[PDB]
Write a protein that binds this DNA or RNA. Sequence first.
DNA 1: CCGACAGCGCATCAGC
DNA 2: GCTGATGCGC
DNA 3: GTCGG
Length: 326
Amino acid sequence: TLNGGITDMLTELANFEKNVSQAIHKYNAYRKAASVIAKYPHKIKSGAEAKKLPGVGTKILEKIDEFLATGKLRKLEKIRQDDTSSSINFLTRVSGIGPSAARKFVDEGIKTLEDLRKNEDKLNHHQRIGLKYFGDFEKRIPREEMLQMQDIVLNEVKKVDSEYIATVCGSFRRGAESSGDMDVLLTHPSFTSESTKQPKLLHQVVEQLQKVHFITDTLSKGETKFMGVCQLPSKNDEKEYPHRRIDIRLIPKDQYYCGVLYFTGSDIFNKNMRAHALEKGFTINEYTIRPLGVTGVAGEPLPVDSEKDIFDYIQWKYREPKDRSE
DNA sequence: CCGACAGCGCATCAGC
DNA sequence: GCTGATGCGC
DNA sequence: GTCGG
Ligand SMILES: Cc1cn([C@H]2C[C@H](O)[C@@H](COP(=O)(O)OP(=O)(O)C(F)(F)P(=O)(O)O)O2)c(=O)[nH]c1=O
Ligand SMILES: [Cl-]
Ligand SMILES: [Cl-]
Ligand SMILES: [Mg+2]
Ligand code: NA
Ligand code: NA
Ligand code: NA
């Protein structure tokens, strides 16, 4: 939090560009700038100083100068006064409402939390559950609660079939003292890049987690990706825990290391690392790392037997999960 | 100056 | 129905 | 919005 003021301002700008302008490159530029400044280990004294960092250019440098001189940004002060922008921004805080639906709702006079509740029939399923847990989904998850949730998930997965491996990723695997949701990577020897010798591998786990009333709602679900809602059990007379977002990603077991790399993140770390792989002539996704030929077409999967193997290919020294919080 | 910006699962819709 | 584009969110 | 070539 050395430069928390600056990185808050850049984040609010990124959200403005994504949600209101629908200019996704400005949104990623602002977030990259915010990220490179959050890890800069000096208290920034001028835009010139910040311009030296990659991702901060002239425009952001001027904005930082204004913010340092005045403590605020006039552009953001006007944005906060604009009722249309404020309405659109607020609606995207509901899970499943992105910039397009937010502007659609605002155009029809659906602009507050009450309005969504009275127009629940204009929402799709995901958006309906997002509204239902709107307040809970804004709460952070203490790591101590993440530890209880992991113990349930792993034990219930083990009960379905002892050959499953479930791995909690996200910021929890990076060591964070609090997480926004739970991200679970799942493998089973029956599911490899060569064959799926067992159907319903993800369904069986989801079902068992619903049976014990851990999973409470479903946002979306397919053969390899589940997104939904869970809740820890409370003791007698105790207030209930908040409802929590849970994502489960079933990945072919022989592709575990690209999967765990992807699911551990952060998202900006993935973007940097994947960008760097391109510069080095490779493409990385959650399944494989592949060379790119002279035509930039993805070649065949390269052998991977560790996270570090993926770093080696692109000539990065290995970074532990705790150092990928970008 | 300007092309590229990481990569992809699931939900929904439009055209057929 | 399937196919492709778009939305949304990892 | 930023930047590598
Ligand atoms: C959102 C996002 C996620 N990911 C990867 C990287 C994340 O760490 C992983 C889990 O997504 P997440 O939205 O739960 O992020 P997170 O890192 O776990 C988090 F720190 F944002 P939080 O703990 O609050 O969920 O999916 C991407 O590669 N691209 C993305 O755009
Ligand atoms: Cl843009
Ligand atoms: Cl792998
Ligand atoms: Mg997460
Ligand atoms: Na710079
Ligand atoms: Na949203
Ligand atoms: Na997640």
